[PDB]
Scaffold this active site. Structure first.
Site, short mmCIF file in Angstrom:
data_model
loop_
_atom_site.label_atom_id
_atom_site.label_comp_id
_atom_site.label_asym_id
_atom_site.label_seq_id
_atom_site.Cartn_x
_atom_site.Cartn_y
_atom_site.Cartn_z
N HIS A 40 2.05 4.79 -2.80
CA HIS A 40 2.04 6.27 -2.46
C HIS A 40 3.46 6.56 -3.01
O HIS A 40 3.51 7.63 -3.86
CB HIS A 40 2.14 6.57 -1.20
N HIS A 66 -5.46 7.73 -2.49
CA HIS A 66 -6.25 6.61 -1.80
C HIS A 66 -7.35 6.51 -2.99
O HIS A 66 -7.95 7.03 -3.53
CB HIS A 66 -6.90 7.00 -0.69
N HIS A 124 0.86 -1.27 0.09
CA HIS A 124 0.00 0.07 0.06
C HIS A 124 0.84 1.15 -0.28
O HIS A 124 0.71 2.20 -0.66
CB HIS A 124 -0.91 -0.10 1.26
N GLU A 125 1.92 1.25 1.07
CA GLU A 125 2.84 2.42 0.98
C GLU A 125 3.43 2.74 -0.23
O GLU A 125 3.65 3.85 -0.87
CB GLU A 125 3.74 2.32 2.15
C1 LIG Z 1 -5.53 -3.29 1.46
O1 LIG Z 1 -4.13 -3.21 2.14
C2 LIG Z 1 -3.86 -2.10 2.91
C3 LIG Z 1 -4.97 -0.90 3.02
C4 LIG Z 1 -4.72 0.37 3.68
C5 LIG Z 1 -3.37 0.20 4.43
C6 LIG Z 1 -2.97 1.59 5.13
C7 LIG Z 1 -1.67 1.94 5.67
C8 LIG Z 1 -1.37 3.19 6.28
C9 LIG Z 1 -2.60 3.67 7.10
S1 LIG Z 1 -2.30 5.29 7.99
O2 LIG Z 1 -0.97 5.01 8.68
O3 LIG Z 1 -3.75 5.44 9.08
N1 LIG Z 1 -2.36 6.64 6.85
C10 LIG Z 1 -1.03 7.29 6.45
C11 LIG Z 1 -1.10 8.78 6.54
C12 LIG Z 1 -1.31 8.95 7.91
C13 LIG Z 1 0.29 9.45 6.19
P1 LIG Z 1 -1.27 6.89 4.54
O4 LIG Z 1 -2.15 5.69 4.29
O5 LIG Z 1 -1.62 8.27 3.48
O6 LIG Z 1 0.23 6.35 3.92
C14 LIG Z 1 -3.90 3.36 6.87
C15 LIG Z 1 -4.13 2.21 5.94
C16 LIG Z 1 -2.49 -0.82 4.43
C17 LIG Z 1 -2.83 -2.12 3.64
ZN LIG Z 2 -2.28 5.13 2.39
#
Ligand SMILES: COc1ccc(-c2ccc(S(=O)(=O)N[C@H](C(C)C)P(=O)(O)O)cc2)cc1
Ligand SMILES: [Zn+2]
Ligand SMILES: [Ca+2]
Ligand SMILES: [Ca+2]
Ligand SMILES: [Zn+2]
Length: 163
Positions: free
Chosen positions: A122, A128, A118-119
């Site tokens: 980005h 998203h 996921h990361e």
């Molecule tokens: C389907 O597989 C996945 C879906 C979502 C996440 C995921 C990763 C990070 C977050 S986070 O740390 O709450 N948000 C990050 C942000 C605070 C900087 P981000 O998702 O934009 O990287 C939330 C969900 C991981 C795996």
């Molecule tokens: Zn994310």
């Protein structure tokens, strides 16, 4: 599905470096999670990922606790799991993971492979998705990882940027 400003890598052959490791998994398991995470995107685009352990890589991967130099501190269990920077030089594209999370390669929170995959989305310029089944969905949800392949929306997302 795409990050505003449309930030993307100009090169398709990118390198990544695992700067440090979480002790919760063996180094091999961490390397496998990361390798498989990148492969998800590589098989759906022209992107090629190679690992290096010395020198400057395009995508740095590291596990950090709280404040770690980029003004976006981690916060202990749950909450902020990790974060990455959009394509660019320097810190751009880098992916950081909260060292205080429980990191696994099982169904227990949080599966490193999934969070990393996921990361890296980005890291490659994807934003998203509203699709709850998409890898780029905003909130973490475990999905079987044994034969995990990029979900349809994510394939459409990377294709939209890199073909
Ligand atoms: C389907 O597989 C996945 C879906 C979502 C996440 C995921 C990763 C990070 C977050 S986070 O740390 O709450 N948000 C990050 C942000 C605070 C900087 P981000 O998702 O934009 O990287 C939330 C969900 C991981 C795996
Ligand atoms: Zn994310
Ligand atoms: Ca956290
Ligand atoms: Ca970088
Ligand atoms: Zn960071």
């Amino acid at each position: 599905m795409l990050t505003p400003g449309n930030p993307k890598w100009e090169r398709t052959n990118l390198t990544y470096r695992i700067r440090n490791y979480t002790p919760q998994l063996s180094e091999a398991e961490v390397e496998r999670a990361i390798k498989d995470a990148f492969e998800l995107w590589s098989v759906a685009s022209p992107l090629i990922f190679t690992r290096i352990s010395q020198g400057e890589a395009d995508i740095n991967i590291a596990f950090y606790q709280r404040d770690h130099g980029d003004n976006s501190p981690f916060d202990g269990p749950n909450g902020i799991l990790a974060h990455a920077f959009q394509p660019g030089q320097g810190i751009g594209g880098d992916a950081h993971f909260d060292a205080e999370e429980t990191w696994t390669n099982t169904s227990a929170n949080y599966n490193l492979f999934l969070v990393a995959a996921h990361e890296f989305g980005h890291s490659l310029g994807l934003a998203h998705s509203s699709d709850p089944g998409a890898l780029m969905y905003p909130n973490y949800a475990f999905r079987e990882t044994s034969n995990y392949s990029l979900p349809q929306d994510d394939i459409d997302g990377i294709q939209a940027i890199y073909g």
